[PDB]
Amino acid sequence: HKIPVEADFLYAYSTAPGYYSWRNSKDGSWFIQSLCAMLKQYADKLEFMHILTRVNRKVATEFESFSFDATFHAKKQIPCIVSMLTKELYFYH
């Protein structure tokens, strides 16, 4: 007769808990670049969690930092999908 007040929320984090989130001053953030690209290509074809999984793979494989500062050089990033959804989500019908 009731549902949790925290149900039906989806948090698409650009990075893993406790981690830095990378951005490119020219192309934008790694995560948003990838998210928009995957939505444009798959929003009329795949369920949302599967689109976000493609985003995870794109960010994880196609990006790596370049810095004159060794501390921030050659770093990687993995986004973090946090789902409290109770149903599959398709942007189309």
């Binding site: 490119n24 020219k26 953030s29 599959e88």
Partner: protein, 146 residues
Amino acid sequence: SGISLDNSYKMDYPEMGLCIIINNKNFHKSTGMTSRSGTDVDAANLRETFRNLKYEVRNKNDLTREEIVELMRDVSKEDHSKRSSFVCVLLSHGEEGIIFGTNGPVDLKKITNFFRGDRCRSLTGKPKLFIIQACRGTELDCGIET
């Protein structure tokens, strides 16, 4: 009618819903925070991407912590009855569980609480999506060669 399975959210309401994009690039000196160059690229990319998904996009730039809370509160008070979902994108500096306004922090829980199933009845049972582009700490991933 025939067998009915409710495995997917009803996304055929008259409207897909709102897509609120908060883009913070410039921060107050006292915060000691530096600017976020190139964030406008993200804001524009998101606006176009969600426009094509039929979302009513609303872009906001350089909002203080007070303005972010006010905005979220006001949005959660709107009547979303004819909307299928809700989307909020946050572009800013951050820490674990925190997103930064131009003049200070905002706990992500404070923002999302306005949309709880018991506080925003017109969104109860509908997907509420929060897309967060912000640091969640200082750790750096060194990666591993494959």
